[PDB]
Design an enzyme around this catalytic site. Sequence first.
Site, mmCIF file in Angstrom:
data_model
loop_
_atom_site.group_PDB
_atom_site.id
_atom_site.type_symbol
_atom_site.label_atom_id
_atom_site.label_comp_id
_atom_site.label_asym_id
_atom_site.label_seq_id
_atom_site.Cartn_x
_atom_site.Cartn_y
_atom_site.Cartn_z
ATOM 1 C CG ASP A 136 39.620 43.688 48.994
ATOM 2 O OD1 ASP A 136 39.902 42.674 49.683
ATOM 3 O OD2 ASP A 136 38.452 44.069 48.781
ATOM 4 C CG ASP A 176 39.741 39.614 52.399
ATOM 5 O OD1 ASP A 176 40.277 40.432 51.611
ATOM 6 O OD2 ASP A 176 38.671 39.836 52.980
HETATM 7 C C1 LIG Z 1 36.386 42.081 53.940
HETATM 8 N N1 LIG Z 1 36.004 42.812 52.687
HETATM 9 C C2 LIG Z 1 36.929 42.923 51.630
HETATM 10 N N2 LIG Z 1 37.996 42.190 51.517
HETATM 11 N N3 LIG Z 1 36.599 43.792 50.584
HETATM 12 C C3 LIG Z 1 35.551 44.797 50.662
HETATM 13 C C4 LIG Z 1 35.989 46.037 51.400
HETATM 14 C C5 LIG Z 1 37.107 46.217 52.191
HETATM 15 C C6 LIG Z 1 37.230 47.505 52.770
HETATM 16 C C7 LIG Z 1 38.306 47.937 53.638
HETATM 17 C C8 LIG Z 1 38.525 49.321 53.953
HETATM 18 C C9 LIG Z 1 39.594 49.719 54.777
HETATM 19 C C10 LIG Z 1 40.453 48.730 55.323
HETATM 20 C C11 LIG Z 1 40.252 47.367 55.009
HETATM 21 C C12 LIG Z 1 41.125 46.383 55.525
HETATM 22 N N4 LIG Z 1 41.831 45.585 55.944
HETATM 23 C C13 LIG Z 1 39.200 46.961 54.160
HETATM 24 C C14 LIG Z 1 36.191 48.330 52.366
HETATM 25 S S1 LIG Z 1 35.112 47.511 51.342
HETATM 26 C C15 LIG Z 1 35.038 45.056 49.221
HETATM 27 N N5 LIG Z 1 33.981 44.051 49.022
HETATM 28 C C16 LIG Z 1 33.443 43.833 47.764
HETATM 29 O O1 LIG Z 1 33.506 44.679 46.862
HETATM 30 C C17 LIG Z 1 32.704 42.584 47.535
HETATM 31 C C18 LIG Z 1 31.293 42.756 47.239
HETATM 32 C C19 LIG Z 1 30.520 41.618 46.990
HETATM 33 C C20 LIG Z 1 31.131 40.307 47.043
HETATM 34 C C21 LIG Z 1 32.513 40.144 47.370
HETATM 35 C C22 LIG Z 1 33.314 41.287 47.603
HETATM 36 C C23 LIG Z 1 33.816 43.205 50.198
HETATM 37 C C24 LIG Z 1 34.318 44.107 51.300
HETATM 38 C C25 LIG Z 1 34.684 43.359 52.592
HETATM 39 O O2 LIG Z 1 33.798 43.300 53.450
#
Ligand SMILES: CN1C(=N)N[C@@]2(c3cc(-c4cccc(C#N)c4)cs3)CN(C(=O)c3ccccc3)C[C@H]2C1=O
EC number: 3.4.23.46
Length: 386
Positions: free
Chosen positions: A36, A232
């Site tokens: 991520d 992302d």
């Molecule tokens: C988009 N996006 C992302 N990039 N990362 C996170 C997650 C992604 C997934 C996830 C699960 C399965 C598949 C896929 C795919 N493709 C993604 C679960 S949680 C983690 N997050 C932070 O920790 C954060 C918190 C506060 C501020 C910034 C980041 C922001 C979340 C989000 O909304």
Amino acid sequence: GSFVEMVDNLRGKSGQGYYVEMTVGSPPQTLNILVDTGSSNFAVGAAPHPFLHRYYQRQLSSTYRDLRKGVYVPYTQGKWEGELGTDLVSIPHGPNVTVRANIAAITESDKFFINGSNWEGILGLAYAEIARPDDSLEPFFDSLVKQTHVPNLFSLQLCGAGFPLNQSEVLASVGGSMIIGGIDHSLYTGSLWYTPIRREWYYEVIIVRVEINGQDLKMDCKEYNYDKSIVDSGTTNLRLPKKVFEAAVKSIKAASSTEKFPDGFWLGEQLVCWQAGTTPWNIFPVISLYLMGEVTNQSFRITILPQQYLRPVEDSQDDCYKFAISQSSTGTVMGAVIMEGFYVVFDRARKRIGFAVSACHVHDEFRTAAVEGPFVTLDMEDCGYN
Ligand SMILES: CN1C(=N)N[C@@]2(c3cc(-c4cccc(C#N)c4)cs3)CN(C(=O)c3ccccc3)C[C@H]2C1=O
């Protein structure tokens, strides 16, 4: 050059994300970790959960260190809560190093873990600025660079199959590559073009022009980066700010006008199906994103096909898809839709992001994804939002 030990080390698909195998603790505990670039915490499942086949067991690790500090990470789709600590971490199909990294041991989660996904944690590769609880929590990549001689750079080749993959197929298939500390020339064709990382928090970029089949979307460029534009790997879709999304969808519908699709398809809710092998790729337009170049007044473009933005799904022997372009209230997100078309170089050492045509992108005999330049563009800094 060549990093054969790291080539083909990812698994997954756009809709569920891509993961790498990692080890935590002493003796090493194997876990599948979501890659991520849109977050900055290294966080693993650390208590039983119906969707987890395995989890991190701190009491079985001799090198585990309790930081005696809680961590709460609420986001838009869900949330997770954990306990901070440190342990020794390795990437088996990665660099041949062992690092002491921060680990958020997940004890409680809402809509975080996914039934049938083969991942147990998340590898936040963005900067310390957005890490939770605050920037004092050193992200994994920072620790890896600080503790070893690994160059401060990573590159990702996310490989969309161009067709559905079932549970055993997604486990047996190569989803792509994460090259730690280098650029592997076998994963791309043509030249690498670099865009500057505007600011080191998310991997922020500046989009300067958008085209749909060569036709300028003709919006003030600030609209394209309102309130930011980021790359992302943790986002499935190409997400666009409300105004940009409305303009893009209107242009895409106009270009694809020989076939009428219901409103639910354009909303990403409803799937569209065609008889086996008959998807009319040619009626759908290509999409080009122009990005700020490294040279003053210079830009370059990345072009994707409907083979990138029409996400394959299983229905039958029909070839079915969901429209993978959606609205955003948090700026542009260049997710897996973009990522699958290109080999992406996250050059943290030179505060820049590289794009080249991916050796694994899905295309047809008539069109290919492209990375081309240079283009003369003026007042590019004005495209950035403040
Ligand atoms: C988009 N996006 C992302 N990039 N990362 C996170 C997650 C992604 C997934 C996830 C699960 C399965 C598949 C896929 C795919 N493709 C993604 C679960 S949680 C983690 N997050 C932070 O920790 C954060 C918190 C506060 C501020 C910034 C980041 C922001 C979340 C989000 O909304």
